[PDB]
């Protein structure tokens, strides 16, 4: 009698090329090729990190040794005369 | 106090921006053919090994 199958869902999703049905709490599939890299977004995170580092500096009770403070790319810089430098990540 | 206010206002509106980009990639393409689907309807409908070897093609591959 039947086959009544209507399903707009993937109908959309394929209409948009494709769909969610792979791995929602079954992520492994995409997972099992280990996740990739990214270069486009290699900059918004860095800048936002620099800004929150500036904010921590505002919220610090800094010791006198902080002089020659230069901000850089994913590398907190604190250079002293005796010349040990730590770029930690308040 | 300002700042934390911002913080919120931001990652809130950030929430936006995500849903937004949905809005864009869509909004170009939004409602293709605007019927344009009905096929997909029946399509999936009649969409829904030897089977594949009922391979109209492989069926051409019977030797070849």
């Amino acid at each position: 009698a039947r086959l009544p199958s209507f399903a707009i869902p993937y109908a959309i999703d394929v209409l948009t090329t494709g769909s969610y049905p792979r791995l929602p709490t079954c992520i492994r599939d995409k997972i099992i090729p280990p996740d990739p890299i990214t270069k486009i977004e290699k900059q918004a995170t860095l800048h936002q990190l620099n800004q929150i580092l500036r904010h921590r500096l505002v919220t610090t009770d800094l010791p006198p040794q902080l002089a020659n403070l230069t901000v850089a790319n994913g590398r907190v810089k604190f250079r002293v005369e005796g010349e040990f430098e730590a770029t930690l990540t308040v | 106090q300002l700042q934390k206010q911002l913080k919120e206002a931001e990652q809130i509106l950030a929430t936006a921006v995500y849903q937004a980009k949905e809005k864009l990639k869509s909004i170009e393409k939004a409602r293709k053919g605007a019927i344009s689907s009905e096929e997909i309807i029946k399509y999936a409908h009649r969409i829904s090994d030897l089977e594949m070897r009922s391979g109209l093609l492989g069926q051409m591959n019977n030797p070849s």
């Binding site: 290699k42 995170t45 994913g74 | 950030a14 929430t15 995500y18």
Partner: peptide
């Protein structure tokens, strides 16, 4: 399975300087 803020942890872990 969310958060704009969370991303910062995964990007922070992925991200660095045979």
């Amino acid at each position: 399975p969310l958060s704009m803020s969370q991303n910062l942890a995964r990007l922070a872990q992925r991200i660095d300087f045979w």
